[PDB]
Design a protein around this ligand. Structure first.
Ligand SMILES: CNCCCN1c2ccccc2CCc2ccccc21
Ligand SMILES: CNCCCN1c2ccccc2CCc2ccccc21
Ligand SMILES: CNCCCN1c2ccccc2CCc2ccccc21
Ligand SMILES: [Cl-]
Ligand SMILES: [Cl-]
Lengths: 156, 152
């Protein structure tokens, strides 16, 4: 999987909306509580060059919040979220002001990718770039949300 | 010009899409149904032999001919319709279930193939057909899932 060249995480700070999601395996996304069914609410880069994700997930009939620190690696668009080097975040592309494409990758190989947007509206341009970035990846499920869903906890 | 006699026989559900996530987001979901066989009737109706995951249950639904070619009605209330979008008879068939009952119209589309193998050409024609439709969930199966019927 190829990641963005020249990513500056200081420009991705702020609140985001998970507009669309895709995964390598149906069971990663299909259920409300599926493992990769996570909604990005905020990106917070640190001065050290780590990227904190504020996530929401449906768990046991409620929306739960989770913070995940993705630690910098030698690749500016590749972040590690465990000490075993099994789980990574890959930033595929961003224009900073409208959309950001990224993937969770597990090489224990499982992949779950998202199209984030800055404003809770459908962005057909961001959706086209998402589909173009996924073309070479072995996705078996895609989901997309409406503007009403983007503004509710856990996209209810 | 759809020829229902040539779509007869064995099929496999390769991919599925729907207008609403909750139509396809579980094995239990209402549109999560796998086509096993199409049987044309002498009167020009199309019987769909389906399997649905419960707790694999078989279901037969008769799609009756209408005055519009490749459009079939399932009920007498004209609420549920089957649309045949495209086929080459020998490899793939694309179709959509539609329900136009209140308050919002539901749509659920499938790509069927003749053999339990992934067909990138059929999946590309399905993807192209879905581009103009307001789908919010799409799924494709691997050859293992193709052979194991309702079990994925
Ligand atoms: C398989 N690892 C944990 C399962 C969920 N997970 C995924 C899913 C697909 C690919 C990679 C990952 C990595 C970790 C992660 C982080 C946040 C949400 C889901 C996931
Ligand atoms: C492996 N590439 C499949 C391409 C088409 N495909 C997509 C597209 C984007 C994201 C996920 C998927 C997987 C399932 C699917 C189902 C139906 C039509 C297209 C697609
Ligand atoms: C609303 N009908 C409930 C059963 C699900 N169903 C769907 C789903 C979405 C859109 C249309 C339809 C038409 C009827 C039908 C027939 C066979 C399987 C599922 C469905
Ligand atoms: Cl770089
Ligand atoms: Cl989708």
């Amino acid at each position: 999987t190829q990641t963005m060249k020249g990513l500056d995480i200081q420009k991705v700070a702020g609140t985001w909306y998970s507009l669309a999601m895709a995964a390598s395996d149906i069971s990663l996304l299909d259920a409300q509580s599926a493992p990769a069914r996570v909604y990005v609410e905020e990106l917070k880069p640190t001065p050290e060059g780590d990227l904190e994700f504020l996530l929401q997930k449906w768990e046991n009939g409620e929306c739960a919040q989770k913070k995940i620190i993705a630690e910098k690696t030698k690749i500016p668009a590749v972040f590690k979220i465990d000490a075993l080097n099994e789980n990574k975040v890959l930033v595929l592309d961003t224009d900073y002001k409208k959309y950001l494409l990224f993937c969770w990758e597990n090489s224990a190989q499982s992949l779950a990718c998202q199209c984030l947007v800055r404003t809770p509206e459908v962005d057909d341009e961001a959706l086209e770039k998402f589909d173009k970035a996924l073309k070479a990846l072995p996705m078996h499920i895609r989901l997309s949300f409406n503007p009403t869903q983007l503004e509710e906890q856990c996209h209810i």
